[PDB]
Point group: C3
Chain length 225, copies 3
C-alpha cells in the first residue's frame, strides 16, 4: 500500500511540474512567469522527495520505529515556496513575508526534531512547539497578511478568503496525520499514513498551485485598466 502511494506521489508531482513548467515557458508577463516558476519548483522538489521515498530512501529505523526523515528536508524547501505563492499574490510587506517564512521554517525544523527524537516525550514537546509555530503563521495569515492583501485588492477579498481557507484547512491536517501515525498514537498503519501524507502533499502542492494560478487570473481581471 505504502509503495503504490509513493509512486502515485511521484506521478502526481511530476505531472504538476510538467504543467507548471509549460505555463512558465509560455508566460505572457513577468508576474505570471514568477508565479508559474514558484509552483514549478514546489512540485519539482516534491517529485524528488517522492522518488527518493519510492526508491526506499530517506527512512531510518529509530529505536525500532520506522521514520521517514527525508520529507522534512524537502518540506523545508517546498513549504517556503508555498508561502511565497501567498505573499506574491498578496503583495505582502517585507517584515510580514519574512515573519511568515521564519515561522514556517521554525515549524518544519521543529517538526523534524519532533519526528527524529528517539525519546518520544521530547519529540512530543517539539510537536507542541511546532504547532505553536504553525499557530503563529495562522495569526499572521488571517491578520496582517489578509489585511494587506485586502488593502492591495479591495475588490478581491473573496480571492484571499479562498486562498487562506484552503491553505489553513489543508495545512492543519498535517499535524493531525502526524498524531495518528507512528510519531504519535500509531492509530493508523504506515500504509495509511503514507497515503494520507501523499494525498495531502499532492493537494497542497498541485492543487494549491492551480488555485494560485486561478487566483492570479481573478486578481488581474479585477485590476484591468
Amino acid at each position: 500500500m505504502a509503495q503504490i502511494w509513493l509512486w502515485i506521489g511521484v506521478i502526481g508531482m511530476a505531472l504538476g511540474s510538467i504543467f507548471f513548467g509549460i505555463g512558465a515557458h509560455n508566460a505572457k508577463n513577468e508576474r505570471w512567469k514568477i508565479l508559474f516558476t514558484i509552483n514549478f519548483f514546489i512540485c519539482a522538489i516534491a517529485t524528488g522527495l517522492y522518488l527518493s521515498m519510492a526508491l526506499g530512501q530517506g527512512r531510518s529505523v529509530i529505536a525500532g520505529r520506522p521514520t521517514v526523515w527525508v520529507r522534512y528536508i524537502t518540506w523545508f524547501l517546498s513549504t517556503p515556496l508555498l508561502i511565497l505563492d501567498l505573499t506574491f499574490l498578496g503583495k505582502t510587506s517585507l517584515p510580514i513575508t519574512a515573519s511568515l517564512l521564519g515561522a514556517n521554517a521554525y515549524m518544519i525544523a521543529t517538526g523534524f526534531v519532533a519526528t527524529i527524537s528517539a525519546d518520544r516525550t521530547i519529540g512530543h514537546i517539539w510537536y507542541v512547539v511546532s504547532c505553536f509555530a504553525f499557530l503563529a503563521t495562522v495569526y499572521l495569515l488571517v491578520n496582517q497578511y489578509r489585511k494587506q492583501a485586502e488593502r492591495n485588492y479591495p475588490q478581491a477579498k473573496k480571492v484571499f478568503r479562498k486562498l487562506l481557507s484552503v491553505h489553513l484547512v489543508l495545512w492543519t491536517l498535517y499535524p493531525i496525520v502526524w498524531l495518528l501515525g507512528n510519531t504519535g498514537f500509531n492509530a493508523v498503519n504506515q500504509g495509511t499514513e503514507t497515503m494520507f501524507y501523499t494525498i495531502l502533499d499532492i493537494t497542497s502542492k498541485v492543487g494549491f498551485g492551480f488555485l494560485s494560478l486561478n487566483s492570479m487570473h481573478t486578481l488581474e481581471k479585477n485590476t484591468e485598466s
Copy 2:
C-alpha cells in the same frame, strides 16, 4: 551546573523573544517592524537551541569528548541576523553586507568543523581558519561598515562606535571560551563552559537586541525633520 544554565538560557531567550515580539507587533513604522522582527527571530532561534540542549539533545561523545554540535547549527542562523542588525542600522551597501554575512558564515562553519573533528590537531587548524574569518569581519566592520555608517549618519558616529565596540568585545570572547573548553586546553569544566556560552549568548542576543533598539531610537531622533 550545566543543566541549570541551559534552562537559564531557555528562559532568557524566551523572554527576549516575547519582548521583541511585542515590540514587532506594536511597531509604528516598517523600519521599526523590521528591526524588532530581526531580533525576535534571533532570540526565537536561540530559545530553540537552548531547549534542545536543556533536553539533552544536540550533543555527541566524539572519541570520548562530549561535544555540543547543535549550537553551530543555530548560530549559523542567528549570527547572520545579528550581522543584519548592524547592516540594517548602518544602511550598509550590498557588497559589504554580503561580505560580512559570507565571512560570518565562514567563521561559524569552520568553527563547527574545528569542534567536531576527532583529530584535534585538524580541529585546531580549523580554529585558526575560523579566527581569520572573524578577523575578516573585524576589518570590514571597523573600516567599510563604519565609514559607510558615519557617512549615512554624520551626527551619530558615537552610536556606531558603541554598537561596534559591544559587538567586537563580546564576539571575541567566544573563541576564548572555545580555547578554555574541552575543544582546546580544557582549562574549565563543562558546567563552567556551559555557563560562559550561556551568558555570552544571552548578552549577544537579548543584550545586543536591546542596544540595537536604543541605537535605532537615537538614529531616528538625530534624523528627525
Copy 3:
C-alpha cells in the same frame, strides 16, 4: 597522487581568493566590487573544500567504496555563485535567475544523492536526474539567459558566447569524470579522478573568475558614454 592534487587545489584556490580579494578591496565602483566579491567567495569556499579534503576529511567508505561527500556540500554553495557571475553580467531577469539557481541546486543535490547512495542502481538513477537538471540549465542558458544578455548588450554578443561556451564545456566534463570514477565505471583510479576534479575546479573557479572580470571590462568599455 591524490594527496598532492588536493594540496594543489588548496594552493590554487587560495591564490584565486587572494587576487579576487585584492581586486574587491581596490574596486572602483559597486558593480566591480560585487563581481570581485562573488569570485572571492567562490574561491574562498573551494579553498575550504580543498583544505578539508587534503586533511583527510569529507570522505566515507560506503559499502566498501571510498566516497568524497564534502565536495557536494561546498559545490552547493560555490556553484550558485558561479551562476550569479553569469546572471550579474547578463543582467538576467528574476524568474530566469531563480530558475538557473533552482535547477543548479537540483543538479548538485541529486548529484550528492547519486554519489552517496549505497545502491548504485539507485545512485545511477539520480545521476540521470542530475543530468536532466543540468540540461535544464543548458536550455535556460542558451535561450532565455543568452537572449536577455544580447538584448542588454547588443554590441557584446561575443562576450556572452565566450562565457557560455566556457561554462557549458567545462561543466559538462564533471558528469563525465563522475562516470569514469568509482561512482560509475571506475575506469580511472582515485588519484586520477582527484586530479581531474581538481583541475576542473581550479579552471571553473579561478579560470572562470578571471574570464568574468575580463568580460566585465569588455562590457563596460562597450557601454562607455
